[PDB]
Amino acid sequence: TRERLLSALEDLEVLSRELIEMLAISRENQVLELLIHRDGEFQELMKLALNQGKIHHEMQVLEKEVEKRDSDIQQLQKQLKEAEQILATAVYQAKEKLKSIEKARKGAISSEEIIKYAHRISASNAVCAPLTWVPGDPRRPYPTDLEMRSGLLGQMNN
Amino acid sequence: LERVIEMIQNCLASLPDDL
């Protein structure tokens, strides 16, 4: 609206100057009547300008309320986020232990079978080394060359 | 769990005080 105001200003200015100047050089009713029209329309635009100034003051109060509600929203957000993160790590470690419990639920063996199998796995040192071992000792945690060459696999097919 | 609950609670306790 500033453009229309300023155009009405400069138009009023130099055309009123022209009316004054033709009066002065005489000693033009049409451009007079148009000057009357420009003056009235300029005063109407000044009234609209004061009204829009009231509108802008209302807008300033309103955007201050906007920023205050934005700050309230964000102060909800950050605290809800930190609560979310703490509970997320908590339920994650709990679901780790629950996964391990559910794997243990799948396999359930009688105790004597566990003891018997532990005896077969560690009567001869198969899964855990002999206590006095130096490199070059023949025994190994794999089958070994002699057990392979003396088994049914090596002998009975050959 | 308890801490998270009371955390949520006090933040909710903050929000009508903004309203």
Curated annotation (Swiss-Prot), chain A:
GO terms for biological process: positive regulation of DNA-templated transcription; positive regulation of transcription elongation by RNA polymerase II; positive regulation of transcription initiation by RNA polymerase II; regulation of transcription by RNA polymerase II; RNA polymerase II preinitiation complex assembly; transcription by RNA polymerase II. One of its GO terms (cellular component) is mediator complex. Component of the Mediator complex, which is composed of MED1, MED4, MED6, MED7, MED8, MED9, MED10, MED11, MED12, MED13, MED13L, MED14, MED15, MED16, MED17, MED18, MED19, MED20, MED21, MED22, MED23, MED24, MED25, MED26, MED27, MED29, MED30, MED31, CCNC, CDK8 and CDC2L6/CDK11. The MED12, MED13, CCNC and CDK8 subunits form a distinct module termed the CDK8 module. Mediator containing the CDK8 module is less active than Mediator lacking this module in supporting transcriptional activation. Belongs to the Mediator complex subunit 4 family. Component of the Mediator complex, a coactivator involved in the regulated transcription of nearly all RNA polymerase II-dependent genes. Mediator functions as a bridge to convey information from gene-specific regulatory proteins to the basal RNA polymerase II transcription machinery. Mediator is recruited to promoters by direct interactions with regulatory proteins and serves as a scaffold for the assembly of a functional preinitiation complex with RNA polymerase II and the general transcription factors. It comes from the Eukaryota. Signal peptide: none annotated. It comes from Homo sapiens. Residues 1-23, 56-97 form a coiled coil. This is Mediator of RNA polymerase II transcription subunit 4. Keywords: Acetylation, Activator, Coiled coil, Nucleus, Phosphoprotein, Transcription, Transcription regulation. It is found in: Nucleus. GO terms for molecular function: nuclear thyroid hormone receptor binding; nuclear vitamin D receptor binding; transcription coactivator activity; transcription coregulator activity. The modification Phosphoserine is found at residue 7.
Swiss-Prot record, chain B:
It comes from the Eukaryota. Component of the Mediator complex, which is composed of MED1, MED4, MED6, MED7, MED8, MED9, MED10, MED11, MED12, MED13, MED13L, MED14, MED15, MED16, MED17, MED18, MED19, MED20, MED21, MED22, MED23, MED24, MED25, MED26, MED27, MED29, MED30, MED31, CCNC, CDK8 and CDC2L6/CDK11. The MED12, MED13, CCNC and CDK8 subunits form a distinct module termed the CDK8 module. Mediator containing the CDK8 module is less active than Mediator lacking this module in supporting transcriptional activation. Belongs to the Mediator complex subunit 7 family. Constitutively sumoylated. Transmembrane segments: none annotated. This is Mediator of RNA polymerase II transcription subunit 7. Component of the Mediator complex, a coactivator involved in the regulated transcription of nearly all RNA polymerase II-dependent genes. Mediator functions as a bridge to convey information from gene-specific regulatory proteins to the basal RNA polymerase II transcription machinery. Mediator is recruited to promoters by direct interactions with regulatory proteins and serves as a scaffold for the assembly of a functional preinitiation complex with RNA polymerase II and the general transcription factors. The gene is MED7. It is found in: Nucleus.
